[PDB]
From Swiss-Prot, chains A, B, C, D, E, F:
The modification N-acetylalanine is found at A1. It is found in: Cytoplasm; Nucleus. A lipid is attached at A6 (S-palmitoyl cysteine). The chain holds residues 2 to 42 of 154 of the full protein. There is a cross-link at W32 (1-(tryptophan-3-yl)-tryptophan (Trp-Trp) (interchain with W-33)). Belongs to the Cu-Zn superoxide dismutase family. Homodimer; non-disulfide-linked. Homodimerization may take place via the ditryptophan cross-link at Trp-32. Heterodimer with SOD1. The heterodimer CCS:SOD1 interacts with SLC31A1; this heterotrimer is Cu(1+)-mediated and its maintenance is regulated through SOD1 activation. Interacts with DAOA; the interaction is direct. It comes from Homo sapiens. The gene is SOD1. This is Superoxide dismutase [Cu-Zn].
Amino acid sequence: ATKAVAVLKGDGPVQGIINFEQKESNGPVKVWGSIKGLTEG
Amino acid sequence: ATKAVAVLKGDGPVQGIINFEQKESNGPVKVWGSIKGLTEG
Amino acid sequence: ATKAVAVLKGDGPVQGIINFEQKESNGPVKVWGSIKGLTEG
Amino acid sequence: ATKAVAVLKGDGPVQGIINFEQKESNGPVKVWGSIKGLTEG
Amino acid sequence: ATKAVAVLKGDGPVQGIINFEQKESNGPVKVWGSIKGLTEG
Amino acid sequence: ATKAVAVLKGDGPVQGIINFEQKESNGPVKVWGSIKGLTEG
C-alpha cells in the first residue's frame, strides 16, 4: 500500500528522522537538529 | 502493506531515527541531534 | 505486512534507533544524540 | 486567576464532564452521552 | 491560581468526570456515558 | 495553587472520576459509564 525509499550519497551528516511513518496516533513529534562545525570536500 | 528502505553511502554521521514506524500510539516523540566538530573528505 | 531494511556504508557513527517499530503503545519516546569531535576521510 | 463553579438542582442525570480545564495539552477529547428511557416530575 | 467547585442537588445519576483538570499533557481523553432506564420524582 | 471541591446530595449513582487532576503526563484516559435499570424518588 505504502512504500518509502531514502538514498543519500553525501558526506554530510544526517540529522533527524528517516522514513518516519507516524499513523493514526496522537503526539507532538519534535525534531531538533544542531551542528556547529565545518566540513570539507 | 508497508515497506521502508534506507540507504546511505556517506562518511557523515547518522543522527536520529531510521525507519521509524510509530503507529496507533500516543507519545510525543522527540529527537535531539547535536554535532560540534569538523569532517573532511 | 511490514518490512524494514537499513543499509549504511559510511564511516560516520550511528546515533539513535534503527528500524524502530513502536506500535499500539503509549510512551514518549525520546532520542538524544550528541557528538563533540572531528572525523576524517 | 481562573475559577469554575457548577450548580445544578435538577432531577435530570448528568452526562459528560464538569469543570473540565484542559490546558496547554494535545489530545482529541471526546465526550459521548446516550440516555434511552423516560423521566418524570 | 485555579479553583473548581461542583455542586449538585439532584436525584439524577452522575456520568463522567467531575473537576477534571488535565494540564500540560498529551492524551485523547474519552468519556462514554450510557443509561437505559427510567427515573421518577 | 489549585483547589477542587465536589458536593452531591442526590440519590443518583456516581459513575466516573471525581476531582481528577492529571498533570504533565501522557496517557489516553478513558472513562466508561453504563447503567441499565430504574431509579425512584
